[PDB]
Amino acid sequence: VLSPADKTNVKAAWGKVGAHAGEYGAEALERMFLSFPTTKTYFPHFDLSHGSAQVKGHGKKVADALTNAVAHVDDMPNALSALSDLHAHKLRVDPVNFKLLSHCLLVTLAAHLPAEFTPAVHASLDKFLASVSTVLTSKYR
Amino acid sequence: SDGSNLEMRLTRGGNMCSGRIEIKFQGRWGTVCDDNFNIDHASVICRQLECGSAVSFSGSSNFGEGSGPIWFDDLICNGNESALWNCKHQGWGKHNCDHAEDAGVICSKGADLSLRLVDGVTECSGRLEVRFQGEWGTICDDGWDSYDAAVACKQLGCPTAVTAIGRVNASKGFGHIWLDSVSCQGHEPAIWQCKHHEWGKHYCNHNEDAGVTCSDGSDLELRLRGGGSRCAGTVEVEIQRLLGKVCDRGWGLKEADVVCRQLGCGSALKTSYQVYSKIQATNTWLFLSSCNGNETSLWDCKNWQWGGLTCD
Amino acid sequence: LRLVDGVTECSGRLEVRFQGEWGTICDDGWDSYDAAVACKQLGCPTAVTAIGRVNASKGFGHIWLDSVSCQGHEPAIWQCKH
Amino acid sequence: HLTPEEKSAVTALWGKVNVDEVGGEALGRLLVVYPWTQRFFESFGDLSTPDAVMGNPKVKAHGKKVLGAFSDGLAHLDNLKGTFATLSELHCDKLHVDPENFRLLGNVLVCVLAHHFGKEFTPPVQAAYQKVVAGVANALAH
Amino acid sequence: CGKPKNPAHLDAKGSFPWQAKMVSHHNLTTGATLINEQWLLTTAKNLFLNHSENATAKDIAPTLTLYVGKKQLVEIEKVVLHPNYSQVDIGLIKLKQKVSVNERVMPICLPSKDYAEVGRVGYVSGWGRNANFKFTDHLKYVMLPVADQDQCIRHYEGSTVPEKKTPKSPVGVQPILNEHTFCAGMSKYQEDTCYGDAGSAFAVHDLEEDTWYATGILSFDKSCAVAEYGVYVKVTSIQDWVQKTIAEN
Ligand code: HEM
Ligand code: HEM
Ligand SMILES: *[C@@H]1O[C@H](CO)[C@@H](O[C@@H]2O[C@H](CO)[C@@H](O[C@@H]3O[C@H](CO)[C@@H](O)[C@H](O)[C@@H]3O)[C@H](O)[C@H]2NC(C)=O)[C@H](O)[C@H]1NC(C)=O
Ligand SMILES: *[C@@H]1O[C@H](CO)[C@@H](O[C@@H]2O[C@H](CO)[C@@H](O)[C@H](O)[C@H]2NC(C)=O)[C@H](O)[C@H]1NC(C)=O
Ligand SMILES: *[C@@H]1O[C@H](CO)[C@@H](O)[C@H](O)[C@H]1NC(C)=O
Ligand SMILES: *[C@@H]1O[C@H](CO)[C@@H](O)[C@H](O)[C@H]1NC(C)=O
Ligand SMILES: [Ca+2]
Ligand SMILES: [Ca+2]
Numbered sequence: 059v060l061s062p063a064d065k066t067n068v069k070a071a072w073g074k075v076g077a078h079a080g081e082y083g084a085e086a087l088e089r090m091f092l093s094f095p096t097t098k099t100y101f102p103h104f105d106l107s108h109g110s111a112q113v114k115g116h117g118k119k120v121a122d123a124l125t126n127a128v129a130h131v132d133d134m135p136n137a138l139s140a141l142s143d144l145h146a147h148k149l150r151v152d153p154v155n156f157k158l159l160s161h162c163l164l165v166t167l168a169a170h171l172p173a174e175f176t177p178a179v180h181a182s183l184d185k186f187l188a189s190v191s192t193v194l195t196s197k198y199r
Numbered sequence: 200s201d202g203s204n205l206e207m208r209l210t211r212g213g214n215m216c217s218g219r220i221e222i223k224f225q226g227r228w229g230t231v232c233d234d235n236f237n238i239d240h241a242s243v244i245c246r247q248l249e250c251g252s253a254v255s256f257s258g259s260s261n262f263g264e265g266s267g268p269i270w271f272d273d274l275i276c277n278g279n280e281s282a283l284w285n286c287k288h289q290g291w292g293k294h295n296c297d298h299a300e301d302a303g304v305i306c307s308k309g310a311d312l313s314l315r316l317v318d319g320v321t322e323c324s325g326r327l328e329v330r331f332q333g334e335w336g337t338i339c340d341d342g343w344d345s346y347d348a349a350v351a352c353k354q355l356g357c358p359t360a361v362t363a364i365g366r367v368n369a370s371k372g373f374g375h376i377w378l379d380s381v382s383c384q385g386h387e388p389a390i391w392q393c394k395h396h397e398w399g400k401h402y403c404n405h406n407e408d409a410g411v412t413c414s415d416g417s418d419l420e421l422r423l424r425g426g427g428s429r430c431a432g433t434v435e436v437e438i439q440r441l442l443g444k445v446c447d448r449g450w451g452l453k454e455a456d457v458v459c460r461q462l463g464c465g466s467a468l469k470t471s472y473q474v475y476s477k478i479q480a481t482n483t484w485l486f487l488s489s490c491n492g493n494e495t496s497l498w499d500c501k502n503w504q505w506g507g508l509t510c511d
Numbered sequence: 512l513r514l515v516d517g518v519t520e521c522s523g524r525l526e527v528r529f530q531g532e533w534g535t536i537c538d539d540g541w542d543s544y545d546a547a548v549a550c551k552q553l554g555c556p557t558a559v560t561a562i563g564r565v566n567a568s569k570g571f572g573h574i575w576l577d578s579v580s581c582q583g584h585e586p587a588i589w590q591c592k593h
Numbered sequence: 594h595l596t597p598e599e600k601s602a603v604t605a606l607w608g609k610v611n612v613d614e615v616g617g618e619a620l621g622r623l624l625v626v627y628p629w630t631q632r633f634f635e636s637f638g639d640l641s642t643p644d645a646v647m648g649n650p651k652v653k654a655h656g657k658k659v660l661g662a663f664s665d666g667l668a669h670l671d672n673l674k675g676t677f678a679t680l681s682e683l684h685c686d687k688l689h690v691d692p693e694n695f696r697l698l699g700n701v702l703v704c705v706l707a708h709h710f711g712k713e714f715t716p717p718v719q720a721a722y723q724k725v726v727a728g729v730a731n732a733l734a735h
Numbered sequence: 736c737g738k739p740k741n742p743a744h745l746d747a748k749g750s751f752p753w754q755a756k757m758v759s760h761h762n763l764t765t766g767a768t769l770i771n772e773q774w775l776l777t778t779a780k781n782l783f784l785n786h787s788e789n790a791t792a793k794d795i796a797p798t799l800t801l802y803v804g805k806k807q808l809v810e811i812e813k814v815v816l817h818p819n820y821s822q823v824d825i826g827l828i829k830l831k832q833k834v835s836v837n838e839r840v841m842p843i844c845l846p847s848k849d850y851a852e853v854g855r856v857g858y859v860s861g862w863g864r865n866a867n868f869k870f871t872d873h874l875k876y877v878m879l880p881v882a883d884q885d886q887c888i889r890h891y892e893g894s895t896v897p898e899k900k901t902p903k904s905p906v907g908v909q910p911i912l913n914e915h916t917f918c919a920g921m922s923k924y925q926e927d928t929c930y931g932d933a934g935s936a937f938a939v940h941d942l943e944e945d946t947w948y949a950t951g952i953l954s955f956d957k958s959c960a961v962a963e964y965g966v967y968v969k970v971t972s973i974q975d976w977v978q979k980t981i982a983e984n
């Protein structure tokens with residue numbers, strides 16, 4: 059569970075990330091695609107070339123979703139209701155991908171903000187991303 | 200029973216005049232549910248303990264879950280009454296509540312409330328500090344806006360003409376974060392008469408301390424420095440006698456029109472300037488939030504912050 | 512089961528009835544075997560079966576089914592997994 | 594498998610790493626983020642708080658050893674399967690570390706490599722690094 | 736009864752025989768417990784997979800593949816749900832042929848006395864998801880302490896009195912909580928069940944009789960360490976229907 063100190067760490071880290079969140083999300087999407095090709099099956103109608111604006115916008119959307127989740131860390135299931143229903147029944151995204159994406163997102167932060175990515179902040183971000191993934195994948199059926 | 204044998208106590212609080220409400224009946228300690236609990240109940244309670252002027256009332260898990268039976272629920276009380284057990288109620292020991300609905304109260308007698316500013320340019324500019332139960336703390340900036348700054352400036356008694364948010368030139372505080380999510384409407388006599396999140400569970404950190412800058416309006420100046428003319432360059436702000444720059448978190452031509460209009464230099468064209476001269480370095484900055492574009496001055500722009508963040 | 516807003520009586524948007532009202536079907540998971548069983552159920556030729564609504568308009572009301580899988584053996588649509 | 598460009602990139606980048614710090618940091622990150630892995634390292638004493646594991650010399654020594662194994666694997670990219678066979682038997686027989694924990698180590702190791710390299714960790718070389726960590730994880734599995 | 740070969744996240748190496756693995760026709764893994772030579776226990780939610788709940792159990796039975804021991808296949812004959820499945824997710828499954836009890840296939844027999852006392856330490860093993868949300872290749876087993884019922888009700892529903900309940904499950908989905916359930920907290924190292932371990936027995940080791948007793952069947956595995964409590968159905972509250980169903984078949 060997210061302990062109150064854990065919440066403070068997550069809040070501070072996502073405040074420090076700043077407006078670069080959209081770029082980081084796009085980079086995370088591209089990195090997940092490149093590392094594990096199998097995750098591209100869920101984007102058949104997507105221009106996945108280098109510098110594509112489509113994946114840029116998708117990463118911006120994911121980053122905005124995560125920022126909204128952080129703002130509502132105490133009531134996360136309600137914040138991600140629509141996205142949970144979209145990823146659970148409509149798209150039927152497998153749970154594994156989520157963890158993959160999380161790791162990718164994490165590494166992106168480590169690549170751009172080494173100073174603030176202390177081990178405690180690492181634990182906090184991992185717990186928060188695990189909670190988000192579990193909420194989005196909960197109703198998988 | 201006429202109520203003489205009954206006794207009441209506040210437990211698990213900062214001191215005797217604050218905490219969870221408990222009462223003794225039939226030799227058993229118990230709590231009171233927060234159903235239909237308001238400031239009238241709080242005054243009734245801080246009329247009987249000799250602690251006066253009930254500051255705040257709570258509910259649920261503010262002070263921790265209690266133990267024992269529950270005596271009262273769904274009470275209706277007036278603002279002036281001798282004791283809590285004289286109010287109209289369904290019956291002793293009759294309730295639909297559980298210990299996740301216990302009630303707590305904070306009175307003024309233990310709460311020696313006071314407000315101050317520290318570590319700023321002028322007597323009434325800088326970081327806000329609130330005294331609670333003998334300990335000084337700060338206020339989280341989340342939800343801190345111009346109306347709250349107006350209330351604070353009026354509370355301390357210095358000009359209310361221009362009241363901005365932001366801890367100018369002030370460093371991060373140490374200690375407690377007593378207040379958060381203050382929601383003053385702009386006319387309350389003190390910052391703690393407004394609605395605000397509980398005093399316990401805050402996730403802010405000390406990089407987020409709140410502050411205010413109050414001024415008559417005769418000490419704020421705005422200039423363009425660096426360039427061949429008064430109408431082009433980097434925008435610099437001299438507030439009180441402190442010099443600083445503006446951060447471009449959301450800088451666009453929309454706010455450049457307001458700034459150019461203020462200086463009387465026409466309309467904004469480009470967000471850059473030929474490097475004619477050199478400008479000195481400064482550490483305090485000003486941050487803006489989405490000016491509409493038709494404002495007659497940059498000071499009228501909604502919720503502008505004077506320091507307290509970084510432009511990394 | 513009915514076909515509406517199509518070129519002939521044998522092509523168009525597919526509708527199903529329940530509780531007394533008609534409703535539409537989502538195309539996701541709708542494969543050639545589903546169209547084959549839909550054609551077979553109705554009194555229409557079944558030599559060639561294709562997916563898609565031809566020059567038909569958008570739906571109205573409630574969507575009363577999604578992601579079916581008939582496999583081609585079940586005589587009727589509602590006997591399939593849904 | 595690794596294409597010649599990926600091989601060149603991965604070898605060149607690994608040539609810039611330091612043995613004595615990055616492996617220890619990766620191990621400490623695994624201990625702090627996934628608590629159930631402390632059971633195996635109980636021998637190293639106090640692992641209760643992050644600063645303790647970061648400040649433990651034994652953690653740094655074992656990080657050095659695992660990084661040496663990783664460098665050996667890099668030197669035997671073609672024959673990873675036989676390179677780590679002894680270690681596979683060791684972890685399968687005496688310790689009962691599940692195959693997933695190896696991949697956990699690989700991900701934390703990649704994280705700290707990103708931490709150290711900064712901008713230099715371009716996604717194309719990260720793909721190769723993911724492939725090599727996957728290879729070593731599979732080789733150690735059973 | 737109750738003699739495993741070896742009493743003892745950590746990879747099992749000869750300790751949990753009663754466990755059984757199930758996969759639906761659309762490749763989702765779930766767990767089950769051996770109760771006797773021919774009968775099992777499982778959660779009802781593991782039976783309504785990829786089809787509407789209006790279908791009959793006869794339609795469910797042939798669509799589920801079942802493994803026991805070391806990847807030893809078995810065939811399902813019948814599936815019978817509890818008449819009040821909406822509030823208790825017990826579901827029993829009958830094997831095509833009675834299994835030959837051996838070290839890798841051996842049941843877990845049921846409590847004669849309740850063991851869901853706060854602080855009691857029990858064992859839970861399952862084929863569910865892991866830290867990377869991939870189904871575990873090797874059987875996993877964890878140790879959990881029983882947790883207070885009132886705290887669990889507060890965690891998932893807020894208040895104990897029915898009129899005042901409101902959903903507050905941290906993982907979105909809400910479990911079935913009533914007098915037929917009990918909850919368990921995380922382990923010492925913050926280990927908790929996740930997707931796919933439903934149906935696994937909450938085993939308690941009684942030293943006086945040196946016997947393992949199945950105390951509950953996990954009915955909420957969506958906690959995945961995000962929620963603080965996992966939810967189980969009490970076997971003692973289900974003993975009678977189990978006995979009646981076994982006798983009737
Ligand atoms: C932290 C985890 C994730 C978050 C916060 C997230 C968030 C979002 C958001 C905000 C949208 C846009 C919805 C809309 O515009 O209506 C979306 C759509 C989508 N997501 Fe995710 N997502 C996550 C994980 C994943 C993963 C792991 C995959 C696949 C491997 C995935 C695949 C998709 C797809 C295919 C769409 C539809 C895009 C489209 O139709 O244009 N998502 N997600
Ligand atoms: C995935 C890549 C891994 C590599 C390359 C690796 C390599 C090694 C090597 C070379 C040793 C020998 C140390 C010695 O002889 O003193 C060792 C020992 C050991 N490893 Fe691993 N290992 C890996 C994964 C893991 C993981 C994931 C864990 C636990 C989570 C683990 C736990 C241990 C333990 C407990 C020892 C013995 C330490 C002691 O008792 O002194 N290993 N490993
Ligand atoms: C998409 O395509 C179908 C196939 O053509 C359209 O159906 C046809 O719609 C036209 C109207 O443009 C109908 O024409 C009318 O026919 C009657 C025959 O008695 C006549 O009285 C009218 O003067 C007029 O010509 C036509 O009957 C109808 N069907 C056929 C077989 O041609 C359909 O409207 C299109 N749109 C949708 C939403 O499906
Ligand atoms: C930041 O704050 C310090 C606080 O000390 C400012 O110095 C104060 O200036 C006012 C106005 O003249 C005086 O009343 C105080 O006595 C001063 N304090 C001193 C001199 O210790 C200072 O000007 C500010 N510094 C910067 C760099 O912004
Ligand atoms: C400035 O523009 C806004 C947006 O239309 C408008 O509401 C406001 O009244 C304007 N202010 C003045 C002083 O005209
Ligand atoms: C199911 O619940 C009903 C509620 O009235 C009860 O009468 C019945 O005995 C229950 N059945 C079982 C098998 O517990
Ligand atoms: Ca209430
Ligand atoms: Ca009430």
Ligand SMILES: [Ca+2]
Pocket residue numbers: 340341407
């Ligand atoms: Ca803030």
Ligand SMILES: [Ca+2]
Pocket residue numbers: 342343344347380381382383
């Ligand atoms: Ca406010």
